Amino acid sequence: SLHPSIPCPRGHGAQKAALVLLSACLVTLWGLGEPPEHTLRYLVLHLASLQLGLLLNGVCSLAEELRHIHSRYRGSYWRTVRACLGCPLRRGALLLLSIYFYYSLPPFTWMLALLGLSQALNILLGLKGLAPAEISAVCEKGNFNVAHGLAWSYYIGYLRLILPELQARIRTYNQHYNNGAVSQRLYILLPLDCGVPDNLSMADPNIRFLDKLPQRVYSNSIYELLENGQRAGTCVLEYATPLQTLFAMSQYSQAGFSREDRLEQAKLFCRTLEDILADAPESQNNCRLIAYQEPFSLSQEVLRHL
C-alpha cells in the first residue's frame, strides 16, 4: 500500500506450520504402533519437565527482577511473580500437577537434577536465547518500537494542530491570490533511508520552491512540481522531522541505534503514521504521505500523487 518494502503485520504462519507438524507427528506415531499408555506417561512427564524448566527459568529471572520490585512493579511481589512466570494461577496449577505426576509416574530426583542442570546451563551460557524473528514478533505485537512513539508524538504534537487550520489558511491563500490553487492537503515526505536534505532543491532540481503558505505561524513550502520545465502542480510539502531524528540517532553512538534498526524503524514509522492518519478525526483527507526509497526522482512521485 504505502510502499512495497513496508512490512505488513505478521500472520499466523507459525500456527499453520505447527498444525502440519502435529498432523505429521500423529501420523508417524500411528506408523510406530507403540503402546500409548507409555506415550501418555512420557508426554505428561515431558510437559511436567518443561513446566519445571520454565519454572526454573522464571525463578532465575525473578532473582533479577526482585531488585526492580519497587521501580517497574510499584513494590508488589505478586506483580513481579506474574511478570517472571506468566499467569500465576495457570502456571501454579500446571506446576502442582507437574509435581504430582512427576512423583507418581516414574530414579525420581536424578531426572530433576539433570533437568535443572540443563536449564541453568541454558541461562548461563545463553542457550535459551531469542532469535531475531521472535524478538521482532514480540516487539511488533506489543508495540515496543521507537517508530510507534515517534509517529504518535508527531501526529499529536504537529499534525493535530495545523490540519484543522490548514484548509482555512489555503482558502485564504486562494482568495487573496489568483495565480494557482494549492490543495488543502499537507503533503508529507517519507524517505525510507531517513536522509532528508535541508531543502528540496538539493533533493531534486525539478521541484522548485514557489511561495510560502500564508499563516501561531507554520511555515509551508508550496513547490513548483515542474514536468519538463513547466508548472504541472502546486502542493504544500513539509518535511517529516521524525525520519530525520532516526538518522541522527543512527549517527550518535549513545543512542544504541544500528542502521538495520534505523531502516526498520523508518519502515514502521511510515506504517504506523499511515495507520494513525487513516482513522484520525482531524485528518479529513487533507493530509497525504509521500513515501519513497532510493533504488528515480522524487518529483515524479509527487506528480503521481497530484
Next chain:
Amino acid sequence: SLHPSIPCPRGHGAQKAALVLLSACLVTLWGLGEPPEHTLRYLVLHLASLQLGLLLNGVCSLAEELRHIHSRYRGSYWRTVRACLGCPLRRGALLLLSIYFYYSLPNAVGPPFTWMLALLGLSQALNILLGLKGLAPAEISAVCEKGNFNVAHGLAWSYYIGYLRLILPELQARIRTYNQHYNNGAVSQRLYILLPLDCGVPDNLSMADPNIRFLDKLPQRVYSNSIYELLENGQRAGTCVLEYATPLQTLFAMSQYSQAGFSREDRLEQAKLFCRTLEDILADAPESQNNCRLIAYQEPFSLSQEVLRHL
C-alpha cells in the same frame, strides 16, 4: 537518579541464580551417583532434544517469516534463516551433533530414535499451536530494554535532537541578550524542563500551582521559550525558564487514544524510561554541557518547591 521510581538498567541476577542452581544440582548429582556416562549420554541427547526443539520452533516460526522475506529481510533467504534460527553455523553444528548422536547413541530410559522425534514434534507443535512456548513479561521487558525497543527511547532522542539541540546553544546567547537589556533578578541560562511521571501536563503552568506565575517572554521557526518565576511566601525566591517536557504530554495522549494500543501501564513505564533516557542523553551531550536541568516529580507536595530547591 532523576526519581526513586525510575528503573535502573538490568543486572545479571538471572546468571547468578543460574550459577547457584547449577552448583546445587551438581552437588545433588555427586550425592546420588547415578551412572555417570549414561548421565552424560542423556545430557547430550537432552541438549540435542532442546536444540531440536529450538530447530522445530524456528522451522514453524520460519513459516511466518518466509512470506515477509522481501520486505523485512531485503529478499535474502540466509537473512531470514538467521532471523528464525539464530546463527546458522553454530546452530547447524549443534544440530549435526544432535542428529549423529541420537542416531548412534542408545536410549535406555527414554524414547528410541523416531519415537523421540515424534513426541518432541508433538510437544513443540502443542507449544506453538496452543501458544505454550510464550514469553513472560519479564523476559519481554528485558529484551526490549536491551535492544532499545521502546517508544520512550525515540521520544527522548527526538525531543533532545529537535528542541534542546537547537535552542540550548542559542539559549545562553539569547538570555545574555535578555539580561544585557534588562536589570532585575537574572534568568539562569539553563533551560529547566519538568518531568511529571504521572504524565499530567496542564496547558498552563501558572495554573499548575499558584507559586509559579508567568513573568515575561524570551526575545529572540522561532523558539519563544516562556520564562517563569517562583513565589516563596509572596516573594520571588528564584526565576528560570520553566517549561514542560511535551513528550510526556504526547505519551498521555497516546494512552488516551484507543488506536495506539498503548495501555496505562505502558504509559507509566514509557514515561519513566523517557525520563531516564533524557537524563542519559543530556549527561554526555556536547551541546548541553551543564546547560539544562530536569525536574522529575510524581504527584501522589508542590511543583514550585522542588524547582525552588533545585535553584
Next chain:
Amino acid sequence: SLHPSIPCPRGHGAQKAALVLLSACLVTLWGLGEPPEHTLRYLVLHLASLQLGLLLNGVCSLAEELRHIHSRYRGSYWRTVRACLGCPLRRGALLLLSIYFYYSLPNAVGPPFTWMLALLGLSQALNILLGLKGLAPAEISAVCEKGNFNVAHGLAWSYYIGYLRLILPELQARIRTYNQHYNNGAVSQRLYILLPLDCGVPDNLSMADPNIRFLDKLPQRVYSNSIYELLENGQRAGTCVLEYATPLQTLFAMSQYSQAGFSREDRLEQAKLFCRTLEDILADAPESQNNCRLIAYQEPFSLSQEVLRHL
C-alpha cells in the same frame, strides 16, 4: 573496493571450515564405530581440560594485569578478572562443571584427579613460559580489525573530523563563487583526495606527473586548496581540487622513525586500512554528500589517468 589490494572485511570461513571438519570427523567416527561410553566421557573430560587450561592461562595473564588495576582498569578488581579470564560467570560455571565432571567421572586412559592437576598445570606453565601458546599473525590481525585496534582507524577518523568535516560545508559555496567569477575555471564542487598506498607523499603535486600542473590557488585558522588541470596528450580534459591526504604522509614518517615501532609491512597494512576506513566514513557521513571523492593508487601508470577517469 577502492583498490584490488585493499583488504575486505574478514568473512566466516573459519566456522565454515570447522563445520566441514566436524561433519567429516563425525562421518569417520560412524565408520569406525568406537564405544560411545569412553568417547563422550573423554570428550567432556577434554573440554574440562581445555577450560582448566584457559583458567591457568588466565591466572598467569592476570598475574601481570593485577598490577595495572589502578590505572588501566580504574582500580576495580572485577573488571580485571573479567578482562583476564573472559566473562566471569560463564567461565566460572564452565569451570565448576569441569571440576565436578572430572573429579567424579572415571578415567581409564587418562590421569587421576591429582595427577591431572599436576600435569595440566605443568603443561600450561610450559605453554606460557616457552611462548608455546602463541598467536599466529592471522589471529592477531583478526582480533585487531574486529575491535578496531589500528592506527589507520584513528588516522582516518581524525582526518575526517578535523579537515574534511570543516572545509566541505564551505567548499561548495567557495567553488560556486569561483565558477561564477570565471567563465572560462570550471571546478567540480567535490574535494579530491589522493591515497597513494606506498605512502609516497612529495611536497609538490606537480612532481607526481607532468600532466598535473598547479593552475590557481582556490580562494578562501584559514583554509586553502589547489586546482590541478589534467593534460590528455597536452590538452586539458578536466580539473578539480586535488590535494594529498596528510595521514598517509604521517604513516610514512612513522615507518621512517625508529621510535614509532612501525615496520614497512605495518605501514602498508595500515595505509590500506586507512583507505578503507576513510572510504566508509565518507560514504556514511552527511557532510560528504557527494562533496568529496578519494583517489587510491599504488605505483607498480599515471595519476593523471586516474584523476581523469574520476572526472
Next chain:
Amino acid sequence: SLHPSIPCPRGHGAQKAALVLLSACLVTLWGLGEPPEHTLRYLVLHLASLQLGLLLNGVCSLAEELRHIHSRYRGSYWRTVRACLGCPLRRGALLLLSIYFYYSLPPFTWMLALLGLSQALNILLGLKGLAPAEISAVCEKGNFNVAHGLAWSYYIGYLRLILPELQARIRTYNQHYNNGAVSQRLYILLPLDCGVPDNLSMADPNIRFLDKLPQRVYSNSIYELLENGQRAGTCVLEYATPLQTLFAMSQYSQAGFSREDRLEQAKLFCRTLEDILADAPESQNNCRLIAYQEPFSLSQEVLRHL
C-alpha cells in the same frame, strides 16, 4: 609520571607466574611418583595433541584466509600459511614429530577423530576466545592502537613544524612588546576525560586570553594565567586536538569506538606523545605537556608547571 592514571608498559608477570606454576607442578609430580616412561609418552602425546589442535585451528583459519591471499599477503601461499599456522618450519617439525609419536605410540585413529571434533567445536561455537587482557597485550605490544597513530601524526604534522620557529616568534614578540615575557615553550593540555571547551577562558575564569602570537601560517594564542584576578604567569596554551578527535570518535556511531575505548586511547595518546617528545630532536624543552583529569582547577595546575 605524566598522570597517576597513565598505565605503564606491560611487564613479564605472566612469565613469573608460569615459572611458579611449573615449579609447583614439577614438585607435585615428583611427590606422586608415577612411572616416567608412560608419563613421558603421555606428555609427548599431550603436547602433540595441543600441537595438533593448533594445526587444525590453523587449517580452519587458512581456509578463512585463503580468500584474502591476494590482498593481505601479496598473492603468495607461503606467507598465508605462515600467517595461519605459525612458523612453517618450526610448527612443521613439531607436527611431524607429533604425527610420528601418534602413529608409533597410540582405537588409534579414534583419538584423532575425537581431537578433530573437539577442535571443530572449539572454532565453531567459539570456545577458545581471547580474554580482554590478552587482546590488549597483543595490541599494545605490536602498536595496534588508535592513540599511537593519533599522537604520531599530531606530532609530525603540527609540533615538528611549529616548535622550531616557536622560540624565534616568541623572542620577536618579546622585543616587540614589553612588561610579561612568555616562555618559549608550547604548553599543550591533556584532559584525560577528552572534554575540551572551545575557549580556555570558558574552561576556567582564572585564565584569560591575552593576544595572538606573531606569525602556510600557524596562529597560536597566548593566555593570561591569572591568579586571584592578577597575572601570575604568561604562556601559550593550546588544546591537544587529538583528544577532541577522540571525543568526537566516541560520539559518532560508525566509529565503533566505545567510551571505554575512548578513555584507554586518551591515556595511550598522552603516554606515547610523552614518549615521542622525550626523544624528539625538534623538542628541546620547548614543549611541556599538562595532563589533568576532572575528579578541576586547570589554571592552578598550569601555574604549578610554571
